[PDB]
């Protein structure tokens with residue numbers, strides 16, 4: 001059953017990939033080679049072209065992503081050659097550097113060796129390569145609550161955070177054959193952060209908020225033609241609402257709205273005053289302003305939705321079915337102000353794609 | 363097949379209704395009576411108790427409604443006795459008066475005779491009993507675009523609007539056996555309207571916005587135990603966002619955001635300024651303020667969501683399955699600030715319920 005799943009996935013992917021690349025005459029021979037390789041070895045190896053296009057198709061098929069217009073410009077880094085933890089560490093450091101690009105963010109993915117017998121070669125524990133730690137002991141909350149379990153796992157392994165609200169978690173990953181993951185502190189020179197100030201309200205800086213420049217999702221599995229790349233971190237630039245309406249605003253995250261209301265000088269006493277809504281807007285304006293002032297790429301939800309509309313038009317013009325998850329595509333503030341809110345999307349899963357996988361901690 | 367559908371629906375409804383009312387011992391005999399009545403007449407007649415509870419269950423089962431906490435206090439008016447267009451007109455006038463209740467809105471439904479052979483006895487053309495007309499000719503847009511087709515149908519029948527942005531449509535409905543509907547102008551003394559002013563910004567009144575007090579949905583079908591009450595208008599009070607984020611804000615409705623931005627003194631030039639979001643918040647604050655000042659019931663989306671959470675808790679505590687449509691339950695502004703956004707809902711259809719039906723115009 002294993003090889004049959006692999007072979008069927010391979011046939012579907014190679015045919016579609018080669019058609020899109022205008023190389024459909026080469027399909028027959030390539031499938032033969034692959035078929036022999038699966039018979040002999042129990043698997044097959046993607047060409048660099050297949051791997052690059054596969055990762056791009058996977059992005060294009062990500063139902064929950066509003067940023068898909070730019071799928072074809074994804075920068076794909078092939079690191080299937082790595083064998084050592086130093087090599088993995090340095091590849092992750094490099095990804096941060098090249099993706100960051102002095103603030104002019106380049107959407108990038110680094111692809112590590114795939115699973116063999118469902119046996120991972122490299123297992124990345126971080127949710128994002130750059131993220132803040134979280135602590136909760138004896139009623140006291142510090143940092144990012146979403147990071148509490150990973151922070152506790154790291155501290156079990158001999159790491160210790162300074163217990164600020166913005167401790168950078170170390171990189172943490174496990175090599176095949178090793179029992180424990182290793183961890184490495186992020187060099188601060190690699191990590192761009194943005195202090196959050198407001199264009200009009202000077203007191204906003206009193207909140208001492210900041211966020212990191214580049215979201216680099218590092219715990220999802222890239223599946224391409226039946227091959228499981230469980231370790232394949234990828235990044236774009238942020239949409240402002242992710243930081244302002246979710247990370248800094250959620251009650252189970254940094255929960256800053258009452259403090260925002262206070263610095264912008266409005267009461268936070270009555271639901272009918274819509275003080276949470278007003279606070280959300282000002283916090284979200286501050287996030288966009290601050291990133292722009294620092295020269296770090298960011299997109300607002302209105303521009304992003306206009307871009308996604310173009311993606312929809314491009315999909316139809318190319319004869320491709322569009323898939324999407326309405327519940328994730330709508331922004332968390334003013335969704336009815338975007339065209340997304342006013343149409344529906346087929347939530348079918350198409351491969352190649354990025355998938356969730358179980359956390360090795362927890 | 364007709365009677366079998368009816369009988370099966372009847373059995374399910376009577377059993378559940380009588381259980382909820384603690385009258386389960388009476389089920390057996392009532393089903394017998396009903397079964398004979400279906401055999402003889404091709405249908406059956408609800409008791410007043412069944413009709414009242416049925417309409418309440420239908421509300422409770424309305425997946426898209428955030429206001430369901432109060433399902434059990436629905437005021438049910440039984441007008442299955444009406445036979446004349448004057449009787450229907452006067453019943454509709456009465457519904458407006460008693461639901462409005464001098465501003466202290468009472469959730470109310472008036473139930474007209476049900477369909478016979480799928481033959482409607484009364485067919486209400488209005489979408490809501492109180493709504494504004496819409497016009498579009500030669501590039502010029504006036505009033506509510508959502509009302510354009512019904513407005514044109516009314517004008518075909520000898521009605522003429524003044525062509526303000528807020529012309530009240532007449533009541534328009536058709537009686538069984540009549541070829542054309544009749545229309546009646548709404549007495550202005552019945553219709554409460556609220557001018558929209560802002561608590562802090564005096565210039566907001568320059569927009570000359572207003573809205574009507576009571577949303578009275580009049581084009582849906584109530585289905586109870588296999589009986590189709592195609593004419594059964596119902597009302598609650600508004601949630602502020604329905605007026606501020608949708609009716610006055612949508613580009614295909616009144617489209618007021620640029621004008622709002624101008625009166626609140628912000629530029630409407632750059633997406634990164636989030637001027638639409640800021641305008642939405644101020645417009646929504648103005649709507650809540652204005653209704654409250656006039657003494658007309660209204661609820662904000664935060665309070666409404668807190669109420670819905672109680673509905674969820676009440677459902678589980680009563681052993682009832684909860685159903686809901688996440689895509690309609692989330693408010694159109696600051697949805698992630700409500701608990702609704704952060705959970706999922708089973709969208710199964712349970713009866714009794716309210717359903718869409720085809721428009722007799724268009």
Ligand code: HEM
Nearest residue numbers: 059062064065066067107108234235236237238239299354
């Ligand atoms: C270029 C800038 C990009 C922007 C502005 C963007 C925007 C977003 C946003 C707002 C989400 C919603 C996730 C959340 O609510 O937390 C999302 C989800 C997602 N994006 Fe993108 N994205 C970008 C680039 C990328 C790239 C380069 C990839 C992969 C190659 C990607 C794959 C995804 C995936 C897989 C998800 C959903 C993950 C999940 O199920 O949790 N995106 N994107």
Ligand code: HEM
Nearest residue numbers: 421424426427428429469470596597598599600601661716
């Ligand atoms: C008491 C105050 C009430 C509030 C605040 C309320 C709130 C809402 C809201 C915000 C919606 C969303 C509809 C839209 O986006 O246009 C809705 C939908 C709905 N409500 Fe309620 N509601 C109330 C009372 C009622 C009553 C009394 C009934 C019936 C007996 C009812 C039945 C429904 C139905 C059937 C829908 C969905 C209709 C459709 O599919 O378009 N509601 N409600």
Ligand SMILES: Cc1cc(N)nc(COc2cccc(CNCCc3cccc(F)c3)c2)c1
Nearest residue numbers: 067215216217220234235236237238239242356
């Ligand atoms: C590449 C990229 C760019 C950009 N601007 N934004 C993103 C956000 O994408 C992701 C990817 C993975 C996860 C998330 C955060 N959502 C939480 C997902 C989740 C699912 C199930 C259980 C959970 F606890 C959490 C967001 C990704």
Ligand SMILES: Cc1cc(N)nc(COc2cccc(CNCCc3cccc(F)c3)c2)c1
Nearest residue numbers: 429577578579582596597598599600601604718
């Ligand atoms: C009773 C009540 C109270 C309250 N505050 N709000 C409501 C709103 O409920 C409804 C009921 C019916 C229709 C709508 C408006 N949504 C449009 C529905 C729709 C569906 C399909 C096609 C359309 F053009 C329009 C809203 C109802």
Ligand SMILES: C[C@H](O)[C@H](O)[C@H]1CNc2nc(N)[nH]c(=O)c2N1
Nearest residue numbers: 340341342343344689690691692
């Ligand atoms: C296509 C999409 O489902 C549509 O715009 C829905 C979205 N959710 C909604 N939610 C509410 N409350 N009211 C609406 O009219 C809509 N419209």
Ligand SMILES: C[C@H](O)[C@H](O)[C@H]1CNc2nc(N)[nH]c(=O)c2N1
Nearest residue numbers: 327328329330702703704705706
């Ligand atoms: C339960 C619900 O689906 C959940 O809160 C979703 C809603 N939509 C979302 N949309 C985005 N973009 N990101 C999220 O994390 C979520 N969370």
Ligand SMILES: [Cl-]
Nearest residue numbers: 215242243247
């Ligand atoms: Cl994030």
Ligand SMILES: [Cl-]
Nearest residue numbers: 577604605609
């Ligand atoms: Cl309305």
